[PDB]
């Protein structure tokens, strides 16, 4: 887990 | 028998038309990196046949620019706010490597 943001 | 001519790296200006864009960005200055020690903003997921996949966005692309905002050496929330508006289109320059 390394800071992904959905867009 | 020999390897063909291949693109090692490039800088692409892409136009994405869109409710969502179809991308998941990862990384940024101050966040756990995505690739190696490069703390840039990268494309970590592309929705299947979404508007970004039609634009040519590839997984692993580095965000250099969005709508004129240079996202080089930027923080994660800096790119999110630059991509959350996206009234109808976003134009982003990306760095693709192989």
UniProtKB/Swiss-Prot annotation, chain B:
Changing residue 21 to R: Loss of anti-proliferative activity. It is found in: Cell membrane; Cell junction; Cell junction, Adherens junction; Cell projection, Lamellipodium. Residues 13-98 form the PDZ domain. Expressed in kidney, skeletal muscles, liver, lung, breast, intestine, placenta and skin mainly in epithelial cells (at protein level). Ubiquitinated; targeted for UBE3A-dependent multiubiquitination in the presence of high-risk HPV E6 proteins and degraded. Palmitoylated. Could be depalmitoylated by LYPLA1 and/or LYPLA2. Palmitoylation of SCRIB by ZDHHC7 is required for its localization to cell-cell junctions, function in the establishement of epithelial cell polarity and the regulation of downstream signaling pathways important for epithelial cell differentiation. The modification Phosphoserine is found at residue 47. It is linked to Neural tube defects: Congenital malformations of the central nervous system and adjacent structures related to defective neural tube closure during the first trimester of pregnancy. Failure of neural tube closure can occur at any level of the embryonic axis. Common NTD forms include anencephaly, myelomeningocele and spina bifida, which result from the failure of fusion in the cranial and spinal region of the neural tube. NTDs have a multifactorial etiology encompassing both genetic and environmental components. Scaffold protein involved in different aspects of polarized cell differentiation regulating epithelial and neuronal morphogenesis and T-cell polarization. Via its interaction with CRTAM, required for the late phase polarization of a subset of CD4+ T-cells, which in turn regulates TCR-mediated proliferation and IFNG and IL22 production. Plays a role in cell directional movement, cell orientation, cell sheet organization and Golgi complex polarization at the cell migration front. Promotes epithelial cell layer barrier function via maintaining cell-cell adhesion. Belongs to the LAP (LRR and PDZ) protein family. Interacts with UBE3A. Interacts with PAK1 and PAK2. Interacts (via PDZ domains) with VANGL2. Interacts (via PDZ domains) with LPP and TRIP6; the interaction is direct. Interacts (via PDZ domains) with TJP2. Interacts (via PDZ domains) with APC; may mediate APC targeting to adherens junctions of epithelial cells. Interacts (via PDZ domains) with TSHR; regulates TSHR trafficking and function. Interacts with ARHGEF7 and GIT1; interacts directly with ARHGEF7. Interacts with CTNNB1. Interacts with MAPK12. Interacts (via PDZ domains 1 and 3) with MCC. Interacts with DLG5. (Microbial infection) Interacts (via fourth PDZ domain) with tick-borne encephalitis virus RNA-directed RNA polymerase NS5; this interaction targets viral NS5 to the cell membrane periphery and nucleus and prevents STAT1 phosphorylation, and thus, the activation of the JAK-STAT signaling pathway. Interacts with HPV E6. Interacts with influenza A virus protein NS1; the interaction results in the translocation of SCRIB from the cell membrane to perinuclear puncta. This is Protein scribble homolog. It comes from Homo sapiens (Human). The chain holds residues 716 to 815 of 1655 of the full protein.
